[PDB]
Structures are given as structure tokens and as C-alpha cells.
Design a protein around this nucleic acid. Structure first.
Lengths: 560, 59, 50, 107, 50, 71
RNA sequence: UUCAAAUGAGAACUUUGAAGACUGAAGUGGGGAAAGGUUCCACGUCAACAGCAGUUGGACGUGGGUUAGUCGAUCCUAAGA
């Protein structure tokens, strides 16, 4: 019953997410690509209608059996340097254009929502059902289509370093899914990395992803996540909410650093190893030794890769926060935006001094504990019929809701959702830069995650504030787009499916919902040498089945 | 950055006064915005620009 | 007395604005001589006599 | 050894010839010392009901013969002194005389 | 007595098993002052070491 | 201030000491094109004077409050 | 003045509760006038002070708060200048 209930809930969530993603992809292709039906629309309205459609399709499941449902992650339609969480609002187009009038050279379309061709757009989504969540993410690239052929298939394969980076992300996702799949009773790993005596820990996955990144000449942005998920806790809070019992491996800039025998100068300069104790954070701190995969649970695999443009020498890729005050500086590519995702820390209990604030606080209390957008609250949200009176009533409510949210932020009853930009800094500047202190102890942000859990640079003892100051005090500062994708993995049992052996179900994955854009190029996991392990692994993942394999994928559903 | 007199002085009264009014509105918006954070270095350029515009008008 | 003239109220307002201890960041300069401001005053001890 | 032995107390024994202003505090001190001597502990606590009874007649008019009971309790954990602990509790009687110390079984 | 069997199941609410103990309070109480206002002492110096 | 804005639809500004009621009314009308029902001022002990502005039922202070930039 | 509870490393004095009290309405209350001038209040904090301790404050650090066509000045005049 438990296995049946779990599989039913997970399959429902995954199929709903896949249907939503396919619908969004088809809608955007019809609007912009394919047939130029002059029905071009920006990002916020599409996001809002997508949320409403998802809510409508969710209203018909578990509406009475249980009393817990929601959308785990808002449908982020993000562009280029955005790390994630960027959800513009329809009322804020004028405000954002007014704020960005100072400079909109390379991101005017990004802020206005009217994507220019070849923008490398990405869609991320997350749905919650009774404490269980499923997430999904992928990317799409659009460019002008041929007019000679009404089939509207533009020149087939497409060229570009960003496209090669996206292909790297796709193949990395395929490889990690394959290695995660080979963790059940079929112990025989399809590689020389084990297969007879190996616990299948994170070291192999680290080596594999590093090899793939090196082969494709594209870096990895430190935002990856391979984490098992227990109910009500999925890592969707990033680092805002503390997680303790997590058994997973994450990627940080402190990782992949040059080793003591890396055959590189690295300007060691006999810097004393940091024997100072890390700040007290209730985290396991990358227990890279124990990652044995066990049944009865669920896992989330989320890979994001940062492309590498023309750089003179190797450096460091990190994430920089974005403010919304325009009073910092002026740059040809400076972005200004107000984040829209917010969460409430139930640990602190306090009352406020506004009737609207009280009402919305109780409403969000009724709403589940997950990131949400202001527009996510609406007595008229489902949008039974499409028109503009409902839209304007929604906006007139959103004004008061925004005021109350500002009151919540003014008091200590919420946390802003940071928006990161992937930015690259050469190692030379950090190595030769000033390091007045070995600690930061800022104690002046909103709350929590002061040292970023683990210290940003335990090696060389560099703090986060100093790191970002040095980053903005540079001369090249090349911006690197990020290709991100994610999916869910469920293990099975003979009890789960007596028809076959304990299988593996891929949620929010599969070709039918993750077909990549037509991309062909070179510099793709070069042959010979010892790199052939990846090619052998992919061939064996293709040919593992004698006449049928133990891997299944969900499928979407028609509207009616 | 900012505005320099040696190229600012080459305009007539009307458009220069309109630009002055627009940048005064911009500075008012910046003053409204600076309520939250305590440090905003951008306002120095605004002040020097408004001073330069007013002085060239007077001259 | 709730009947002070405008100049008297302005004087008191300036005194209130003046009444503060030293900002902490002052001590972080180079070749500093300021240790604690001697112009700080409280109502209990000193009377400004308008 | 949790025990309960209802004793009897007369104030006249230890409140004779004392200042009118401190009759009740003297009564309180004598009561706690009497409990200490007749139990053999270190920590003694009084009852709000007993405080009400002793003060009720007046600040300088405390009644002579008052009936009280003493209960031993094991102290909670992280008590560096001892498990020993005494708690007092009043009980009213129709007549002050005619009663003596009686141990009451736990129930 | 059995009539009181209404709030018995209400103790369970879910939501990370009521947020997973009190952990955000420790970090949120580290600030010298609360609310969102400019502090002429705290905001003067950014680095915690300084 | 926020509570009054939400409840009585009364905006609050900080005005220079030189200005007065008529100046405030003319300024708000010429900068926001909004009808003002009442205006009042009060010099705080800090040193500057603030002002309370009551508009008509035909307008809502929420729109201008969101549009100016502060929430 | 007494007891209990709670906070708190640490409670004759901090908070609440349970008792006893007094000021006895020409009050230790409710407002004010001169004068005082941010002491009112909220939040974190106690090396310096409250001859004693203070986990508290009329103390320390950061902020919030006074809305007049009708209340007083501004209008008029006396002994005067």
C-alpha cells in the first residue's frame, strides 16, 4: 500500500509536470518559433497562465482524499546569466524598464520578456502533492526559420559554444541517470569503475562529471544537487532553510580545486592549511565517503553547467547576488530586478500592525511551506475564462498584497529569495589580492547562511564579501550563461511491480519531454586514451536489455 | 561618468531645462529609494550634474 | 512647556540631533586622535540653558 | 524514602516575646526551621495555602496551634545538593487540641 | 472524555514536521537591532572582523 | 504611516520647512495629477516637517505608492 | 512585608500569581501653569550609575511618535516702554 501510494503520487506529479512542460514548450514555439502567427507575448503573462493551468489540472486530483497540494516551484522562464528564481510580474514591466533605463544593452529583451532569437531560454518547474515534490528543468534555443519550406525546420543542426555547453549538460544528465540507475540488484556496473566490489558513492560521479566538463571544455557552476528527498524536505529552499540529515553530494567552488599533485603552479606559497573550525552549521558538510544507494526512497538530480567563452587562462566561476536599487554603479551589462519568491520561517512567531498584513500572513500560513510568488495568492486565480476584468481585479488585489508583503519584509517574518548571476574571475586576482582577515562574520544580512554553510574559500581563507568585492573589482569579468536541467528518480521493487524486477522510474525526464534542440558540432568527448569509459558506459546503457530493461519513464496526458 | 560643461554648454534653454527637470525627477526617485539602504554612491554624480546644469544656465 | 517659540524648538531639535555617541567606523582611519566625543550631553547632568 | 507524617505545630513555643512588626516572618522562619529539625534535609519549601492560613488571622495575630504536614520528595535531576527535599502543606482541624503526629500511608 | 478526540490529531500539522525544530531563531537573533532601518553604528562597518 | 496609507487612503510625505499647505497641494497636483481632499503638516522634533494628504474616493494611494518606488 | 512559579550562571529587591498592607478624594489619583526638552515608547544589551546587589531602570545602543477655519499666540487695550 505504501509503495503503491508512493508510486501513484510520484507518477501523478511527474506526469503533470511533464504535461505542463510540453505545453509550455509548444506554446512558446507557436508564439515565437514555427509559425509567425504574430501572437508574440512576453514572460510574465505566460508564467501566470502556466501557473493557473497547472493549478486547474491539479484541482482534479486528491481534492478530497487528502488536504495538502501545491506548486513546489513557480514556473521560472529565465534567460542567459540568470541562475534561477527570476519570475517577472505583469504589473512590474513598467517599473523594471524604468529601473533599467540607465543601461539595457545586452539585457533589454531579457528584462522586457520579449526574447531575442538565440537567447537560450530555460524553463524550471516544481509541483507539490501532500508533502512530496517533483521538479523539472530544461532549455530551448530559437532562431529565425526558413521560409522556403512550409515544414518550418530551420537549417537542422545549429552552431554555437552555448549550444555545445547545452549538449554537454544533456550528455552529463544522461550519464548520471545511467549510473544512478545501475545501483539496484543489477550490481554489474557497465564500467571499469566497479561492478563487482563498489558501494557506488559520489567519488565516481564527481570523476565522471569532471571528465565530461573537461571534454566539452565547459565549466560547472556550483549549484548542482544529487540529493535524496524525504517528505516535506527536498532542498528547494537551497540554503535558506537548514538541512541536517541530508545524504547527498553538492558542487562548490571549493571543490575541484587543484590538488597537491595537480602538476600546476597554482601559486601555493606554502599558505597554512585552515585548521580553524568551520562555523557551526547543522549540515553533514559533504560526507563524500558514504553514498550507498538504497531502495524505498526518492532522489533528485539537478545539473547546471556554465559555458566558457574566450578566456586567457583558467579562473573561477561563482554566483553574484543582484539588488534592486540601481544605486550601486553603472555598467554596460548590470542587471536590476526585484525578486518575487519569498518564504516564511515558522520558527519566529510575531504579530504585525496591519489588517492586510494579518490576512495575508494567515493565508500564506494556510499555504504550504515552499517558495511562492505574490500572484500565487488570488481568490480568482484559477481563471475559468480568459478575459481582462479578472486580470485587472487580480492587479487591484496584488497592490494591497504587495503592500502587506513589504510590511512582512520590513519586519522579520520572511526571507528574500536571492537571484544569482554566474560570473567568472581569474585565479590570479584572488591569489594576489588582499586578505585582511581569515573570517567574515558579517552578521548584517537578513538571517542565516552567513558563511554559506561551509566557508566560501576554506583554502586560502577568503570570505564571501571579499570574494564578491574582488569579483566586481576586475577588468574582464566575462559573463557565462548556464544550462540547467533536473529530474527525479524513484527506485522500485518486486513488490512494487511483480511483473518485472525492481526497476527505476524517471520522473520529469525522458526524450518525449526532454528532446534537445538540433545541435551538431565537434570537440565532443574525444576518442582514444582513457576517456573511452564514458563512451563504453553509454553504449552499455543502450544495450543493457537482453530484450527489455529495468528503466521506465512517465508520459504526459492530453487536455481532455 | 557624469556630464561635463565643455560639451553641456552647447545647447539652448528649452531642451536643457527639460533635461534638468527630468534629472530632478530622477534624483527625487533616488532619494525615495535610498530610504532602505544607508549607502548609495551614485547620488554624488547626480548632485554634481544638477549643480553644473544650474550654473551653466545662470552663466 | 508646550509653548516654546519656533527658534527655541529649532534649538532643541538641533540639540537632539547632536545628542549621539561617536560612530564606530571613525576609529578605523589612519593616524586617529578621536577617542570619545566630549560634547555628548544628557538631560540629567548638564543643562543647556537654551 | 518518600514519607508523609502529619505533625502539629504551636506558634506560642517560638513566637513568644518577639516584635509585633515581624510576627508573621518570625512564624515563617520558625516553621521552616522546625521542618528542618524534624526531617533532616537541606531544601524546604512552603505552601501558598499555608502562607494564606498563617497571614489570614492578621500580621500580628497569628494563631497558636496550626496543623501541617511534611512530604519528602526526591529531587529532580541535575540537583547538586541531594535527592532530599521537603514540602509543607496545611490542613485545617475542628479543634486544635486532641491531635498528635500521625504518619499517612501513600495512596 | 472521548469527546476531546478532535485536537488529538491536530497536533500533527506536517510542513517539515513544524519547520524542523527552532534553528532560524538562533541566526535571526544575532543582530544587535531588529526591523529594517539604517543603523549609524552597524551599517558604518561592513566586515564582522572590523 | 503604512497603516494609515492602507486604512484611510492618506499619503504621507516629508516636506521642506519653507513650504506650506498651498505649496504642498500645488506640488502634488502638478507632479501626480491627483485630487487632494485635505492636507496637513507637522514639524517633527527631528528638524524637518512631514505632511499628510487625503485624496478623493476617485483615487487610491496604492497605485501611486507602488509607482513611485517605495512599498 | 510573605510564599510559590517563571526567566536567568547566579533572585530579601526583576515579572506573574497567591496573601497582607498603606496613601484615604485639601491623595502617593486624574489634568495642567512656570520650568524642564526627548527623559514618552519599542527593541537588544548591564564594564560605568541607581552608597547593597541587580537578570531591572528616569542607565547603555538603535529607532518610532505630537496632524487645528473652531484649542492658545497672531487681533485690541491698561499700569508702562
Amino acid at each position: 500500500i505504501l509503495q503503491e501510494s508512493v508510486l501513484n503520487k510520484y507518477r501523478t506529479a511527474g506526469q503533470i509536470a511533464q504535461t505542463a512542460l510540453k505545453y509550455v514548450t509548444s506554446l512558446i514555439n507557436d508564439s515565437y518559433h514555427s509559425k509567425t502567427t504574430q501572437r508574440q507575448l512576453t514572460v510574465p503573462e505566460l508564467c501566470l497562465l502556466t501557473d493557473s493551468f497547472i493549478l486547474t489540472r491539479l484541482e482534479q486530483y486528491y481534492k478530497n482524499k487528502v488536504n495538502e497540494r501545491g506548486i513546489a516551484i513557480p514556473t521560472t522562464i529565465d534567460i542567459d546569466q540568470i541562475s534561477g528564481g527570476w519570475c517577472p510580474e505583469i504589473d512590474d514591466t513598467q517599473n523594471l524598464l524604468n529601473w533599467n533605463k540607465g543601461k539595457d544593452s545586452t539585457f533589454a529583451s531579457s528584462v522586457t520578456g520579449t526574447l531575442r532569437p538565440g537567447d537560450l531560454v530555460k524553463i524550471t518547474l516544481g509541483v507539490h502533492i501532500d508533502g512530496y515534490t517533483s521538479e523539472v528543468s530544461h532549455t530551448m534555443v530559437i532562431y529565425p526559420v526558413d521560409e522556403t519550406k512550409p515544414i518550418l525546420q530551420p537549417t537542422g543542426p545549429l552552431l554555437g559554444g552555448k549550444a555545445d555547453a547545452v549538449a554537454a549538460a544533456h550528455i552529463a544528465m544522461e550519464t548520471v541517470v545511467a549510473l544512478l540507475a545501475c545501483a539496484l540488484t543489477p550490481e554489474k556496473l557497465p564500467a571499469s569503475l566497479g561492478g563487482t566490489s563498489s558501494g557506488i558513492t559520489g567519488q565516481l560521479i564527481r570523476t565522471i562529471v569532471d571528465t565530461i566538463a573537461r571534454s566539452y571544455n565547459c565549466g560547472v557552476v556550483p549549484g548542482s544537487r544529487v540529493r535524496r528527498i524525504r517528505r516535506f524536505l527536498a532542498g528547494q529552499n537551497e540554503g535558506i532553510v537548514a538541512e541536517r540529515e541530508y545524504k547527498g553530494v553538492v558542487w562548490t567552488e571549493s571543490h575541484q580545486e587543484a590538488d597537491l599533485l595537480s602538476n600546476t603552479d597554482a601559486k601555493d606559497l606554502t599558505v597554512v592549511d585552515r585548521g580553524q573550525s568551520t562555523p557551526f552549521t547543522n549540515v553533514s558538510a559533504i560526507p563524500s565517503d558514504d553514498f550507498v544507494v538504497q531502495s524505498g526512497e526518492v532522489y533528485l538530480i539537478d545539473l547546471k553547467m556554465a559555458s566558457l567563452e574566450h578566456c586567457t587562462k583558467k579562473g573561477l566561476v561563482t554566483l553574484e547576488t543582484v539588488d534592486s536599487y540601481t544605486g550601486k554603479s553603472h555598467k554596460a551589462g548590470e542587471l536590476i530586478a526585484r525578486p518575487g519568491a519569498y518564504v516564511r520561517d515558522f520558527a519566529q512567531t510575531h504579530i504585525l500592525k496591519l489588517k492586510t498584513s494579518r490576512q495575508l500572513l494567515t493565508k500564506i500560513d494556510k499555504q504550504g511551506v515552499y517558495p511562492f510568488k505574490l500572484s500565487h495568492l488570488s481568490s480568482n486565480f484559477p481563471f475559468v475564462h480568459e478575459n481582462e476584468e479578472e486580470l485587472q481585479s487580480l492587479k487591484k488585489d496584488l497592490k494591497s498584497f504587495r503592500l502587506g508583503m513589504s510590511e512582512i519584509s520590513n519586519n522579520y517574518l520572511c526571507v528574500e529569495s536571492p537571484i544569482q548571476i554566474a560570473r567568472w574571475v581569474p585565479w590570479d586576482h584572488i591569489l594576489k589580492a588582499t586578505n585582511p582577515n581569515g573570517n567574515l562574520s558579517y552578521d548584517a544580512t537578513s538571517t542565516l547562511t552567513l558563511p554559506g554553510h561551509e566557508l566560501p574559500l576554506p583554502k586560502l581563507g577568503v570570505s564571501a564579501i571579499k570574494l564578491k568585492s574582488l569579483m566586481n573589482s576586475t577588468k574582464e569579468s566575462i559573463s557565462l550563461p548556464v544550462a540547467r536541467e533536473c529530474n527525479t528518480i524513484v527506485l522500485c521493487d518486486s513488490s512494487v511491480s511483480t511483473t518485472d524486477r525492481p526497476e527505476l522510474l524517471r520522473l520529469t525526464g525522458g526524450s518525449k519531454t526532454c528532446q534537445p534542440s538540433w545541435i551538431h558540432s565537434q570537440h565532443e568527448l574525444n576518442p582514444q586514451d582513457s576517456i573511452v569509459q564514458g563512451i563504453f558506459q553509454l553504449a552499455t546503457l543502450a544495450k543493457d536489455k537482453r530484450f527489455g530493461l529495468l528503466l521506465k519513464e512517465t508520459q504526459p496526458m492530453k487536455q481532455k | 561618468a557624469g556630464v561635463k560643461a565643455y560639451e553641456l554648454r552647447t545647447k539652448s534653454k528649452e531642451q536643457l531645462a527639460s533635461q534638468l527637470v527630468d534629472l530632478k525627477k530622477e534624483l527625487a526617485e533616488l532619494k525615495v529609494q535610498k530610504l532602505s539602504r544607508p549607502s548609495l554612491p551614485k547620488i554624488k554624480t547626480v548632485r554634481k550634474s544638477i549643480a553644473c546644469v544650474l550654473t551653466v544656465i545662470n552663466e | 512647556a508646550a509653548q516654546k517659540s519656533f527658534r527655541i524648538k529649532q534649538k532643541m531639535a538641533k540639540a537632539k540631533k547632536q545628542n549621539r555617541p561617536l560612530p564606530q567606523w571613525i576609529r578605523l582611519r589612519t593616524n586617529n586622535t578621536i577617542r570619545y566625543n566630549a560634547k555628548r550631553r544628557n538631560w540629567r547632568r548638564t543643562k543647556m540653558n537654551i | 524514602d518518600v514519607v508523609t507524617r502529619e505533625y502539629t505545630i504551636n506558634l506560642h513555643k517560638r513566637l513568644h516575646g518577639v516584635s509585633f512588626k515581624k510576627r508573621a516572618p518570625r512564624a515563617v522562619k520558625e516553621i521552616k526551621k522546625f521542618a528542618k529539625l524534624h526531617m533532616g534535609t537541606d531544601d524546604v519549601r512552603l505552601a501558598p495555602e499555608l502562607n494564606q492560613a498563617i497571614w489570614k488571622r492578621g500580621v500580628k495575630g497569628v494563631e497558636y496551634r496550626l496543623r501541617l504536614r511534611i512530604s519528602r520528595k526526591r529531587n529532580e535531576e541535575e540537583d547538586a545538593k541531594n535527592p532530599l527535599f521537603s514540602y509543607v502543606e496545611p490542613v485545617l482541624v475542628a479543634s486544635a487540641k486532641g491531635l498528635q503526629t500521625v504518619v499517612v500511608e501513600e495512596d | 472524555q472521548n469527546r476531546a478526540a478532535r485536537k488529538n490529531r491536530y497536533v500533527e500539522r506536517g510542513s517539515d514536521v513544524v519547520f524542523g525544530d527552532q534553528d532560524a531563531l538562533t541566526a535571526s537573533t544575532e543582530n544587535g537591532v531588529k526591523l529594517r532601518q539604517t543603523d549609524r553604528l552597524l551599517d558604518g562597518v561592513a566586515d564582522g572582523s572590523m | 504611516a503604512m497603516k494609515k496609507v492602507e486604512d484611510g487612503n492618506i499619503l504621507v510625505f516629508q516636506v521642506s520647512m519653507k513650504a506650506n499647505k498651498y505649496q504642498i497641494k500645488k506640488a502634488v497636483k502638478e507632479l501626480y495629477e491627483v485630487d487632494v481632499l485635505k492636507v496637513n503638516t507637522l514639524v517633527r522634533p527631528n528638524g524637518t516637517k512631514k505632511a499628510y494628504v487625503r485624496l478623493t474616493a476617485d483615487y487610491d494611494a496604492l497605485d501611486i505608492a507602488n509607482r513611485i518606488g517605495y512599498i
